[PDB]
Design a binder for this molecule. Structure first.
Ligand SMILES: NC(=O)c1ccc[n+]([C@@H]2O[C@H](COP(=O)([O-])OP(=O)(O)OC[C@H]3O[C@@H](n4cnc5c(N)ncnc54)[C@H](OP(=O)(O)O)[C@@H]3O)[C@@H](O)[C@H]2O)c1
Ligand SMILES: NC(=O)c1ccc[n+]([C@@H]2O[C@H](COP(=O)([O-])OP(=O)(O)OC[C@H]3O[C@@H](n4cnc5c(N)ncnc54)[C@H](OP(=O)(O)O)[C@@H]3O)[C@@H](O)[C@H]2O)c1
Ligand SMILES: N#Cc1ccnc(N2C(=O)CC[C@H]2C(=O)N(c2cncc(F)c2)[C@H](C(=O)NC2CC(F)(F)C2)c2ccccc2Cl)c1
Lengths: 392, 407
């Protein structure tokens, strides 16, 4: 009798990540959880064959089922169009899914204490959140004034601001905007993420330079905090504070981690989760590529050692949310247990070649210092079997 | 006999940096180089007594003599206005000098093998450059925001819709860039790449901002193909445009040794500036588009905290590296302008002595803290401000004796 997992939208991907993704399901997920699985093949050949229809259907399935877990995919370039003889240079599946779903992206680096970090003092993870893409830019052919005007719907408080009077020559100009609703959705997603993980939240802004534009972000976060989150933040002993981007960077340099950083906006050790405005829909993926170099080694029968942590944490993050929506304690436990096993295995000295190279330096790595992809996956599977057995 | 260094504009500054600036001149520069020195005292008291006229004169002297070396100065605020009983809250000397000369600021680290950096694989520094002007306002309620271009030659006005706020309000802004500022940014970046002998990359988001960022990519490309391609090829270096996301990822896997000209989006640019263990290991060079005018300084402040201890007679341990490198990078540019081989060698030797002294285990407290962690540093792990300067002086004497073997 396995854990009833419920409805999960799964997206298969490309190259080396496609193989590790199958290994994750076969050795870590399917032996313990049964799912009403909505599988979508986002491999480049299948996106080409279906005229990218499979991507739009996967995005539609995440809207309906609320939980998506996605494998890394190829975003075609000129070189990829010739390799697969593609009909078109298809847009990024991540971009297509992101535009259909909307929300805030939270990036979380997975911390293993024996694996070096950018800043050595980082002991707890840092979560970066961000909601520009709709700016109106143009070329200014020569001298003349560029003005930006606001005309209210009634007509009454109309204002015209001089952006610049070009005099010596031309250049470029652009108008940018941010709707209140977008700032409020980002603020709510950030406060909720901070309470879910139990860490303080910091919003970074440049309000000393953009007093009006960034000033509105700061005020909206401060108002939303004082109105509906400070009582829950005080209860869990966490806080919200604004920081100037230059100040925030210096504070992160002297920090030990353990916070959410909201911005106005080893590689296999980071996840990206899209949290939709409805507070119910989530899409989790590994924040890395398809590992082409390792895939070429695999195609030549050579032994590979590819870090699967980010892809495992896409599964655990998705299953953790699926368990929270359904109130499934068994699933919530399984998701947390797989994350613990993944970190415990690496911290105990069992890791892939790339992690061993971070520690020793590539020229110093011996075969005995690491496990190949299959050996690491089997080591995790043995530790997971033990962790789950000692729970029942 | 001393080297004849030629014309240098020097600007004296404030607090701790003023103290070590004098030790550098006394112990490292003056015993070896004779200069036609144009010195301007940018001390806070002198700027107040001259009504900031010294700052404007220093900037005009840099324009005339092409080489400026600046000590850190106090940018006044309310506490400074009280402390010094200032007449006005004088503007930043760097802001006044930058406005007069123009140019792009390049920040470069000083690498030491035994001193940790953001990315361990970095062996050569990464030089990042940046060449307010934005018009932002709140949109209080529903309505239309439009941006308009009215040609001064009387031709038809062009209007672009920014956004129809159908419900509620928000914020909006207008930004601009002149073609001449973009051209100046490209010239300075190409000239900096050629001076250092490293490849140059321009990072934009031209995929999203097709006309705004595309103008940067296109101007850089056209200036490269017309007046820098052969000079770059002749040094085994090149210019390449890169999307900001590709660029931040290449810099994370590279060993350093490249110029990164970024149009901006400076979260990553700040992490590189503050990612070499200490503020004492970073220099900030203003490079003018003429390829002749330069102004170098430490990319840090006057070190007020250390200065208060100095006033009390307490021992201090202030890092002079960035201040030494403002002098050496200034002297290196002076040497290249005059084809002074003797001066070019001296500036090179002084940089190598500084790096070697630290690499041999002799350093200030901030560098010892980078190695052992601040709680674990003990007095015996470092040298005080004077001891380190005396050790650099001793080592410089030894290096110059070894160099006489070339002749
Ligand atoms: N998330 C996405 O769907 C996404 C985002 C961007 C790009 N892409 C696509 O990915 C394709 C291929 O990108 P890429 O080959 O540069 O892949 P990548 O995953 O970004 O990795 C580049 C290199 O870094 C190392 N590495 C990265 N992740 C690793 C991991 N998990 N475990 C071990 N080593 C890892 C490997 O080198 P070593 O052997 O030296 O360790 C690898 O060759 C592109 O065509 C692009 O369109 C996908
Ligand atoms: N370019 C310029 O002229 C410039 C730029 C910035 C600031 N300033 C001015 O400098 C004054 C003081 O500013 P600030 O204290 O905020 O910044 P700062 O002088 O850069 O000092 C901040 C801290 O950084 C460390 N530090 C910086 N340079 C160091 C060095 N050479 N050796 C050792 N440690 C060093 C010290 O850390 P610990 O305290 O931990 O020892 C120091 O207290 C202000 O009046 C400001 O306006 C001038
Ligand atoms: N807006 C915004 C915003 C805010 C914060 N982080 C980002 N980021 C990205 O866009 C991806 C990487 C990441 C980032 O810039 N960094 C970072 C990374 N991990 C964890 C953090 F808390 C930050 C920096 C970083 O990676 N610097 C290196 C890349 C480089 F610029 F070449 C040097 C970095 C490194 C070390 C100390 C502080 C900093 Cl901010 C964007």
């Amino acid at each position: 009798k396995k854990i009833s997992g419920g409805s999960v939208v799964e997206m298969q991907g490309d190259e080396m990540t496609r193989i590790i993704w199958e290994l994750i399901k076969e050795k870590l997920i399917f032996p313990y959880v049964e799912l009403d699985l909505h599988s979508y093949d986002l491999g480049i050949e299948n996106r080409d064959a279906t005229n990218d229809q499979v991507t739009k259907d996967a995005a539609e399935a995440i809207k309906k089922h609320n939980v998506g877990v996605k494998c890394a995919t190829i975003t075609p370039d000129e070189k990829r169009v010739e390799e697969f003889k593609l009909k078109q240079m298809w847009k990024s599946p991540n971009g297509t899914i992101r535009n259909i779903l909307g929300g805030t992206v939270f990036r979380e680096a997975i911390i293993c204490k024996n694996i070096p970090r950018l800043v050595s003092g980082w002991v707890k993870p840092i979560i970066i959140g961000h909601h520009q893409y709709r700016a109106t830019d143009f070329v200014v052919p020569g001298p003349g004034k560029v003005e930006i005007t606001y005309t209210p719907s009634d007509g009454t408080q109309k204002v015209t601001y001089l952006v610049h009077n070009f005099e010596e020559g031309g250049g470029v100009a652009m108008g940018m905007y941010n709707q209140d609703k977008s700032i409020e959705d980002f603020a709510h997603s950030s406060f909720q993420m901070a309470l879910s993980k139990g860490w303080p939240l910091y919003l970074s802004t440049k309000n000393t330079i953009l007093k009006k534009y960034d000033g509105r972000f700061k005020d909206i976060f401060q108002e939303i905090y004082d109105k509906q989150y400070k009582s829950q933040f005080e209860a869990q002993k966490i806080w919200y504070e604004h920081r100037l981007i230059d100040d925030m960077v210096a504070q992160a340099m002297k920090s030990e981690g353990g916070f959410i950083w909201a911005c106005k906006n080893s590689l296999g050790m980071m996840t990206s989760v899209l949290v939709c405005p409805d507070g119910k829909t989530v899409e989790a993926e590994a924040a890395h590529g398809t590992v082409t170099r390792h895939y070429r080694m695999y195609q030549k029968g050579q032994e590979t050692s590819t870090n699967p942590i980010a892809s495992i944490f896409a599964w655990t993050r998705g299953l953790a949310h699926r368990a929270k929506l359904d109130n499934n304690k068994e699933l919530a436990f399984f998701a947390n247990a797989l994350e613990e096993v993944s970190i415990e295995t690496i911290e105990a000295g069992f890791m892939t070649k790339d992690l061993a190279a971070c520690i020793k330096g590539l020229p110093n790595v011996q075969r005995s210092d690491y496990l190949n992809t299959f050996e690491f996956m089997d080591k995790l599977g043995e530790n997971l079997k033990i962790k789950l057995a000692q729970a029942k």
